[PDB]
Design an enzyme around this catalytic site. Sequence first.
Site, mmCIF file in Angstrom:
data_model
loop_
_atom_site.group_PDB
_atom_site.id
_atom_site.type_symbol
_atom_site.label_atom_id
_atom_site.label_comp_id
_atom_site.label_asym_id
_atom_site.label_seq_id
_atom_site.Cartn_x
_atom_site.Cartn_y
_atom_site.Cartn_z
ATOM 1 N N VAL A 45 0.850 -1.215 0.000
ATOM 2 C CA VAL A 45 0.000 0.000 0.000
ATOM 3 C C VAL A 45 0.877 1.254 0.000
ATOM 4 O O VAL A 45 0.316 2.356 0.031
ATOM 5 C CB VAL A 45 -1.004 -0.001 1.164
ATOM 6 C CG1 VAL A 45 -1.989 -1.139 1.038
ATOM 7 C CG2 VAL A 45 -0.323 -0.038 2.528
ATOM 8 N N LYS A 105 5.229 2.574 -1.245
ATOM 9 C CA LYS A 105 6.647 2.288 -1.558
ATOM 10 C C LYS A 105 7.297 3.642 -1.748
ATOM 11 O O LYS A 105 6.719 4.467 -2.485
ATOM 12 C CB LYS A 105 6.835 1.372 -2.773
ATOM 13 N N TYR A 143 12.772 4.985 1.272
ATOM 14 C CA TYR A 143 13.251 4.491 2.581
ATOM 15 C C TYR A 143 12.403 3.325 3.118
ATOM 16 O O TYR A 143 12.627 2.895 4.281
ATOM 17 C CB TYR A 143 13.186 5.638 3.588
ATOM 18 C CG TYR A 143 13.874 6.893 3.109
ATOM 19 C CD1 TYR A 143 15.249 6.938 2.954
ATOM 20 C CD2 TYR A 143 13.141 8.028 2.796
ATOM 21 C CE1 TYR A 143 15.887 8.086 2.507
ATOM 22 C CE2 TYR A 143 13.762 9.180 2.343
ATOM 23 C CZ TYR A 143 15.135 9.202 2.190
ATOM 24 O OH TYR A 143 15.721 10.348 1.745
ATOM 25 N N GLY A 144 11.423 2.852 2.359
ATOM 26 C CA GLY A 144 10.883 1.505 2.557
ATOM 27 C C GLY A 144 9.525 1.319 1.942
ATOM 28 O O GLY A 144 9.193 2.089 1.020
ATOM 29 N N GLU A 145 8.804 0.309 2.409
ATOM 30 C CA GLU A 145 7.486 -0.110 1.883
ATOM 31 C C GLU A 145 6.513 -0.288 3.033
ATOM 32 O O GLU A 145 6.974 -0.690 4.129
ATOM 33 C CB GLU A 145 7.578 -1.453 1.151
ATOM 34 C CG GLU A 145 8.421 -1.420 -0.102
ATOM 35 C CD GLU A 145 8.729 -2.790 -0.700
ATOM 36 O OE1 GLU A 145 8.212 -3.798 -0.216
ATOM 37 O OE2 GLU A 145 9.491 -2.831 -1.678
ATOM 38 N N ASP A 181 7.880 15.383 12.293
ATOM 39 C CA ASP A 181 7.585 15.246 10.845
ATOM 40 C C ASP A 181 6.069 15.158 10.640
ATOM 41 O O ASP A 181 5.578 14.303 9.908
ATOM 42 C CB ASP A 181 8.345 14.064 10.230
ATOM 43 C CG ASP A 181 8.338 14.066 8.711
ATOM 44 O OD1 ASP A 181 8.092 15.130 8.115
ATOM 45 O OD2 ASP A 181 8.625 13.003 8.136
HETATM 46 C C1 LU8 Z 1 2.445 6.935 7.586
HETATM 47 O O1 LU8 Z 1 3.160 5.916 8.328
HETATM 48 C C2 LU8 Z 1 2.620 4.640 8.356
HETATM 49 C C3 LU8 Z 1 1.384 4.258 7.852
HETATM 50 C C4 LU8 Z 1 0.900 2.972 7.963
HETATM 51 C C5 LU8 Z 1 -0.449 2.668 7.395
HETATM 52 C C6 LU8 Z 1 -1.351 2.097 8.251
HETATM 53 N N1 LU8 Z 1 -2.596 1.815 7.827
HETATM 54 C C7 LU8 Z 1 -2.894 1.994 6.538
HETATM 55 C C8 LU8 Z 1 -2.023 2.504 5.590
HETATM 56 C C9 LU8 Z 1 -2.554 2.641 4.133
HETATM 57 C C10 LU8 Z 1 -3.404 1.634 3.724
HETATM 58 C C11 LU8 Z 1 -3.947 1.743 2.419
HETATM 59 C C12 LU8 Z 1 -3.645 2.813 1.625
HETATM 60 C C13 LU8 Z 1 -4.287 2.886 0.237
HETATM 61 C C14 LU8 Z 1 -4.155 1.578 -0.571
HETATM 62 C C15 LU8 Z 1 -5.485 0.881 -0.983
HETATM 63 N N2 LU8 Z 1 -6.494 1.811 -1.566
HETATM 64 C C16 LU8 Z 1 -6.386 1.794 -3.045
HETATM 65 C C17 LU8 Z 1 -6.405 3.198 -1.033
HETATM 66 C C18 LU8 Z 1 -5.769 3.222 0.372
HETATM 67 C C19 LU8 Z 1 -2.849 3.851 2.036
HETATM 68 C C20 LU8 Z 1 -2.282 3.795 3.363
HETATM 69 C C21 LU8 Z 1 -0.745 2.806 6.027
HETATM 70 C C22 LU8 Z 1 0.301 3.300 5.044
HETATM 71 C C23 LU8 Z 1 1.683 2.082 8.612
HETATM 72 C C24 LU8 Z 1 2.927 2.426 9.126
HETATM 73 O O2 LU8 Z 1 3.786 1.519 9.747
HETATM 74 C C25 LU8 Z 1 3.373 0.155 9.768
HETATM 75 C C26 LU8 Z 1 3.415 3.697 8.986
HETATM 76 O O3 LU8 Z 1 4.656 4.038 9.456
HETATM 77 C C27 LU8 Z 1 4.773 4.238 10.830
#
Ligand code: LU8
Length: 285
Positions: free
Chosen positions: A13, A15, A18-20, A133
């Site tokens: 969800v 990339k 500095y990571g994925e 940040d």
């Molecule tokens: C910012 O930082 C962090 C965030 C997260 C995190 C936790 N829940 C959900 C998300 C996510 C899920 C789904 C989408 C999209 C993809 C599907 N759809 C098409 C629209 C929605 C975007 C974002 C994230 C990225 C986890 C982290 O660490 C494990 C993070 O780092 C601390």
Amino acid sequence: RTVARDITLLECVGKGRYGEVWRGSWQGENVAVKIFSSRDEKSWFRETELYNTVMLRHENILGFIASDMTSRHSSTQLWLITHYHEMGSLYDYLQLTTLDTVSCLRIVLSIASGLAHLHIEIFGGKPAIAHRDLKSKNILVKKNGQCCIADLGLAVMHSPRVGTKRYMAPEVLDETIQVDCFDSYKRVDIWAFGLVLWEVARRMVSNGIVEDYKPPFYDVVPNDPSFEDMRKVVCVDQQRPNIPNRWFSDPTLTSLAKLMKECWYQNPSARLTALRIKKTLTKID
Ligand SMILES: COc1cc(-c2cncc(-c3ccc(C4CCN(C)CC4)cc3)c2C)cc(OC)c1OC
Ligand SMILES: COc1cc(-c2cncc(-c3ccc(C4CCN(C)CC4)cc3)c2C)cc(OC)c1OC
Ligand SMILES: COc1cc(-c2cncc(-c3ccc(C4CCN(C)CC4)cc3)c2C)cc(OC)c1OC
């Protein structure tokens, strides 16, 4: 006892350099898995060190589940596992979604709540914490309409990586920040909060009008603005984000404009505190 450790990675969800981040599954339940580049190992170490110090638990802070380090043939693998918020980041959400008065206030008060929780020292408790940040990509939207703050990889406790340049306060850009002074870091977060409040407020409809999503300073700096680009705008010219005329027809957006102004004073000590921002938001509407 059996310790079922295995997490299934299901869907990437996010990339970046500095990571994925992956949607994963543990015991039939979604988790979020951040896989760090070795280039950003220190963000995993800092967030892990903070959670080993204080196990933060707050409805407006992304929920910690686990930090894992795994030995590989010629590398170290670092994962952070958290709650999964399927609506994604506030940045994501604001691109297509518009808001009404209730949803806009619920979003911004939830963010203020999480930030005041980080900032406050509780005796007996938690150290005071500054984020360093804060931005709309570091805020997740929950199904109940509240948000939570994510990414404590740059956070500092009180009892390499720098902030995102677009969101840096003037004292960070002109290098006058008092680095030995914890209150200085809280005031940097408040500046960034004011920019997030502007990003959200733009997407609140009033009298059939809404602004398109734009990031702060979209009209005065390039994409991936340099440190110098930002310094000239914020420090030398002392520009601030535009408040559209249409906000002054709406009592909610009139009050939010005032609030964001009080987060953007050049003098860091003039800025509102997170607790004062919460009180002001509870009195709007
Ligand atoms: C910012 O930082 C962090 C965030 C997260 C995190 C936790 N829940 C959900 C998300 C996510 C899920 C789904 C989408 C999209 C993809 C599907 N759809 C098409 C629209 C929605 C975007 C974002 C994230 C990225 C986890 C982290 O660490 C494990 C993070 O780092 C601390
Ligand atoms: C090592 O690694 C991972 C482990 C786990 C995991 C799996 N089952 C059970 C557990 C568990 C929790 C807590 C106790 C308590 C019971 C009461 N007693 C008095 C103290 C101990 C025991 C066992 C865990 C922690 C999940 C993981 O990821 C989802 C792990 O990988 C990061
Ligand atoms: C890491 O995360 C998750 C962990 C678990 C999980 C799995 N096994 C055992 C436990 C556990 C049992 C008992 C104690 C305590 C109880 C009271 N006192 C006597 C001290 C000992 C602690 C822990 C847990 C919490 C489940 C989760 O979700 C359902 C987790 O979240 C994804």
